[PDB]
Amino acid sequence: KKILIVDDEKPISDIIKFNMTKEGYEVVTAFNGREALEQFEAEQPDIIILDLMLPEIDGLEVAKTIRKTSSVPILMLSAKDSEFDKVIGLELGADDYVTKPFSNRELQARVKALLRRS
Amino acid sequence: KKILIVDDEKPISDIIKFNMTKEGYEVVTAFNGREALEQFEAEQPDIIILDLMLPEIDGLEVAKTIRKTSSVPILMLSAKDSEFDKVIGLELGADDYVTKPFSNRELQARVKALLRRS
Ligand SMILES: [Mg+2]
Ligand SMILES: [Mg+2]
Ligand SMILES: [Xe]
Ligand SMILES: [Xe]
């Protein structure tokens, strides 16, 4: 399976990439909203882990435009952990919303749960 | 022309109703998100003035669901006046975003501007 990780922090992106690779996923990466959209169209990932906060396009905006054409599962990841953040991510199309810092094992479990249902 | 005013404060709703009536619009009112959606389907207004903050459904959620079926112009009205509020209202489908308190004459000008282009 192919995962697109859209994250503007190279350290966090690498931790997720390393852990998804170890689980046997193919990983493509993007570091802003524009790259996320390009990688999305070109690579057709099975799932996208999307930071809400990105340099070019926000995460909310990326997920909005994705949902125009695609039902690809989106797992939103963010340091913002209030009700309003989670609810607005889910309502703008996230299938799930996990907060940072996260548990590596939980992330993996949640990715598998999204792919199981999809 | 018919305006639906979705506002949970009966005092503000009345001021907008009074002023739109004086301009020759037919007015229907709604005081929460559920009533907005019901009035929307039943009355088919030409334009909707929508408070962002409502008891049942938020304004963002109402405008989201409206846009599923309809291109009816939406003018979002709110006490929240930050960039993030305006931008997220516009991006969730508002044609315009005016802040409270507002100028009666400006509201009217902006309503006419939305109807002119529509
Ligand atoms: Mg990345
Ligand atoms: Mg009202
Ligand atoms: Xe957005
Ligand atoms: Xe929303």
- Please state the three-class secondary structure of A49-106 as a single string: EEECCCCCCCHHHHHHHHHHHCCCCEEEEECCCCHHHHHHHHHCCCCEEEECCCCHHH
Q: How far is A99 from chain B (nearest CA, A)?
A: 21
Resolution of this PDB entry, in A?
2.3
B44: Cβ contacts below 8 Å, ≥ 6 apart: B2, B72
CB atoms near residue B7 (< 10 Å): 25
Query: Token pair of A93, please?
Result: 């199309």
Q: Could you tell me where the beta strands, DSSP code E, fall in B1-118?
A: 2-6, 26-30, 47-51, 74-78, 96-99
Query: Token pair of B95, please?
Result: 């044609």
B98: Cβ contacts below 8 Å, ≥ 6 apart: B75, B76, B77, B106, B107, B110
Report the 3 state secondary structure along B55-78.
CCCCHHHHHHHHHHHCCCCEEEEE
Inter-CA distances, A67 with A24, A93, B47, B93, Å = 27, 7, 26, 15
Query: Token pair of B13, please?
Result: 């709703």
Residue among B42, B100, B96 at smallest CA distance from B73 = B96
Q: Residue A28 C-alpha to ligand 1 middle, in angstroms?
A: 8
Superfamily of domain A1-118: Response regulator (3.40.50.2300)
A27: Cβ contacts below 8 Å, ≥ 6 apart: A2, A3, A4, A5, A17, A20, A21
Taking an 8 Å cut-off on Cβ atoms, the answer to whether B64 and A88 are in contact is: no
Q: Phi first, then psi: what are they for A96, rounded to 5°?
A: -165, 160
Residue among A77, A71, A73, A63 at smallest CA distance from A106 = A77
Inter-CA distances, A15 with A10, A29, A46, B61, Å = 9, 12, 19, 35
Ligand nearest to the CA of A36: 1
> Strands of B2-6's sheet, edge to edge?
B26-30, B2-6, B47-51, B74-78, B96-99
The whole-angstrom separation of Cα B94 and Cα B60 is: 9
| Interface probe with B: pick from A52, A53, A57, A58, most Cβ of B within 10 Å | A58
Residue among A98, A90, A84, A107 at smallest CA distance from A20 = A107
Where b means 16+ CB within 10 Å and e means fewer, B49-73 reads bbbbebeebbbbbbbebbeeeeebb
Residue B84 Cβ inside 6 Å of ligand 3? The answer reads no
Taking an 8 Å cut-off on Cβ atoms, the answer to whether A61 and B91 are in contact is: yes
Residue B91 Cβ inside 6 Å of ligand 3? The answer reads yes
Q: In the PDB record, what is the listed experimental method?
A: X-ray
Inter-CA distances, B30 with B20, B43, B59, B62, B115, Å = 15, 11, 12, 12, 20
